[PDB]
Amino acid sequence: ATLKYICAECSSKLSLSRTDAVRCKDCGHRILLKARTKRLVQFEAR
């Protein structure tokens, strides 16, 4: 149910708030993405 961030390599829904480091649950790989929006998006099909 939900998520927020992600690990570039070991793609694993993660997340946290301020001063929670910027690492991952396993992969140190301090990168982290920000997975899609819930607000669905629409497109012109042309």
Q: How far is the CB of 40 from Zn ion (least distance, A)?
A: 28
Contact 34/22 with Cβ under 8 angstroms? no
Contact flag: residue 15 with other proteins (CB under 8 A): no
**CB burial of residue 43 (10 Å; 0-12, 13-18, 19+):** exposed
Answer for which of 10, 16, 22, 33 binds Zn ion (CB under 5 A) is 10
Contact flag: residue 45 with other proteins (CB under 8 A): no
Is 7 labelled a binding residue? Answer: yes
Q: Tokens representing 44?
A: 């012109």
Indicate the annotated binding residues for Zn(2+).
Answer: 7, 10, 24, 27
